[PDB]
Amino acid sequence: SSNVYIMADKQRNGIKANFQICHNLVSLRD
Amino acid sequence: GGVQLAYHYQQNTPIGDGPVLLPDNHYLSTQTKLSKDPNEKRDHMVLLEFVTAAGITRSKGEELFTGVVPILVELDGDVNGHKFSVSGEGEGDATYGKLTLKFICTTGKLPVPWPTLVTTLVQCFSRYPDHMKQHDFFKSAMPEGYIQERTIFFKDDGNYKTRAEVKFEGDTLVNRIELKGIDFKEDGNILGHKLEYNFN
């Protein structure tokens, strides 16, 4: 379960968001 | 560490000039389940997603989301010169923060892993709890919609830059996306398709 952190961006009358997605690697490729 | 990190920076701007809700600080909690249609020969992704706003203990647009709303998604992509197009259809039930969608690569083989496109491929379908209604920017910008822009940095690899227009076309919520991807390593985890088909 990811978490998208949202904050107002008053200048653009909108929002800003920042977050980290973690993609799992398959095994046996390294 | 057995994972590929993708850092997302996002900004959203209303298309119309009418009133919108500017939220207090909070977050969306998103769970996603990826699957395949056994009878679908094309390269594709079936997605079931639930999103809930959270983080606070405590406009006319949200009225448009009280029932099941049909969704259309169209993406035009260019990653390291590899052109591709994706179409999606499905529906959203914001009452339960619920998305059900099927996406198809209409140009043949998708040149990147499906999970790397999940975040790009409609946060207006998030479930905002009752005590959090006044923080739902996404629905407040409807029906005129919003522009969603991101840069996604894949650590030790390339980046996606996306611009999307999310708005209503009649009764249908539409996500139109242009994606540009650059500086990817030819045998890295993205272009080398080294990612598990799932999403946590």
Numbering used by the authors:
A (entry chain A): 59 to 88
B (entry chain B): 17 to 74, 90 to 152, 156 to 234
Question: What's written in the study?
Answer:
Self-complementing bipartite fluorescent proteins (FPs) are useful tools for the detection of protein–protein proximity and for localizing fluorophores to membrane–membrane contact sites. Here, we report versions of circularly permuted green FP (GFP), red FP (RFP), and mNeonGreen (NG), which are split into a large fragment composed of nine β-strands and a small fragment composed of two β-strands. In each case, the large and small fragments can associate in live cells to form the complete 11-stranded FP β-barrel. We further converted each of these three self-complementing FPs into bipartite calcium ion (Ca2+) biosensors.
Starting from scpGFP1, scpNG1, and scpRFP1, we constructed self-complementing bipartite Ca2+ biosensors that we designated as split green, neon-green, and red fluorescent genetically encoded Ca2+ biosensors for optical imaging 1 (sG-GECO1, sN-GECO1, and sR-GECO1, respectively). The basic design of these biosensors is to have a calmodulin (CaM) binding peptide (CBP), and CaM, fused to the N- and C-termini, respectively, of the FP7-8 small fragment. The rationale for this design is that the N-terminus of β-strand 7 and the C-terminus of β-strand 8 are in close proximity to each other and, critically, are close to the position of the key permutation site of GCaMP and all other single FP-based Ca2+ biosensors. Purified sG-GECO1, sN-GECO1, and sR-GECO1 exhibited ΔF/F min values of 10.5 ± 1.9, 17.5 ± 2.4, and 11.2 ± 0.5 with 39 μM Ca2+, respectively. Purified sG-GECO1 has absorbance peaks at 395 and 491 nm, which are attributed to the neutral (protonated) and anionic (deprotonated) forms of the chromophore, respectively. Absorbance spectra of sG-GECO1 and sR-GECO1 revealed that their Ca2+-dependent fluorescence changes come from population changes of nonfluorescent neutral chromophore fraction and fluorescent anionic chromophore fraction. We next carried out Ca2+ titrations, which revealed that sG-GECO1 exhibit monophasic dose–response curves and have apparent dissociation constants to Ca2+ (K d,app) of 306 nM. sR-GECO1 has a biphasic dose–response curve consistent with K d,app values of 3.85 μM and 1.34 mM. To gain further insight into the structure and mechanism of sG-GECO1, we attempted to determine its atomic structure by X-ray crystallography. Although we succeeded in growing diffraction-quality crystals, we were able to obtain only a partial structure. In this partial structure, the electron density was observed for the FP domain but not for the CaM and CBP domains.
